């Protein structure tokens, strides 16, 4: 219907609860491996936030894997910062991590993150 | 860090994508049965939106069920409207469904929905 009312804070409240489930390791269904480093997550959140994970988990064979290994060139800290952004909308962008964050966001196909990284780099030139 | 930047539309964009996954029946992992009527969903979204589903899917035995049967007194249309609200933040509240929506939101333990239903009923008295 075109007569719906909308709760403004709903989407943010859902995301907060999904991040609390992740913190408590509740119903996490995949491990992302980045070099030495393992990250537990929900496949649905990863697909909702990344063109790479959307392609992976919509594949008839890969949708069934419980472990995904990322390219060895990917920085685990850069992935960690992007995983936190997926579950919170907050990106911990710093001079010392921006190159790794941007390279990881390009690989993961996170368009909005790549665009802000580019803007912050252009301002520093 | 306290130095994070935040993408304002992120939570809403995630929720929109989770609703597109639901529409396409991608990675749905539970069927909710309401009398004759079956609804496919993601356990994580249901837990994020409902105190009842949060209690169900954090239980060591029920977390494993792929089918959940609701109390036969629950109206399938009321459930459908609340399931759409969970995935969109929009509640299709109408004179002809408000009693069923409120009774369903009380059962599902959705506090914000119950509060608006109460306000709209009080205005009609």
């Amino acid at each position: 219907a075109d007569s719906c009312i909308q709760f403004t804070r709903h989407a943010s409240d859902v995301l907060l609860n999904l991040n609390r489930l992740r913190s408590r390791d509740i119903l996490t269904d995949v491990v992302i491996v980045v070099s030495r480093e393992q990250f537990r997550a929900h496949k649905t959140v990863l697909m909702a936030c990344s063109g790479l994970f959307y392609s992976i988990f919509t594949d008839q064979l890969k949708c069934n894997l419980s472990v995904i290994n990322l390219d060895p060139e990917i920085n685990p800290e850069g992935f960690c910062i992007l995983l936190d952004f997926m579950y919170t909308s907050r990106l911990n962008l710093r001079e010392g991590n921006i190159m790794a964050v941007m390279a990881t966001a390009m690989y993961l196909q996170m368009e909005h993150v790549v665009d802000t990284c580019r803007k912050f780099i252009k301002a520093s030139e | 860090a306290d130095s994070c930047i935040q993408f304002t539309r992120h939570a809403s964009d995630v929720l929109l994508n989770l609703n597109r996954l639901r529409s396409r029946d991608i990675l749905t992992d539970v069927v909710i049965v309401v009398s004759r009527e079956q609804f496919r969903a993601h356990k994580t979204v249901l837990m994020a939106c409902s105190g009842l589903f949060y209690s169900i899917f954090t239980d060591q035995l029920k977390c494993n069920l792929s089918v959940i049967n609701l109390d036969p007194e629950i109206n399938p249309e009321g459930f459908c409207i609340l399931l759409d609200f969970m995935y969109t933040s929009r509640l299709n509240l109408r004179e002809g469904n408000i009693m069923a929506v409120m009774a369903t939101a009380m059962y599902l333990q959705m506090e914000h929905v119950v509060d608006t239903c109460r306000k709209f009923i009080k205005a009609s008295e």
């Binding site: 719906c4 009312i5 909308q6 709760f7 403004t8 804070r9 | 929009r90 509640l91 914000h112």
Partner: peptide, 5 residues
């Protein structure tokens, strides 16, 4: 909260 979207 609730608004007219």
């Amino acid at each position: 909260a609730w608004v007219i979207p």
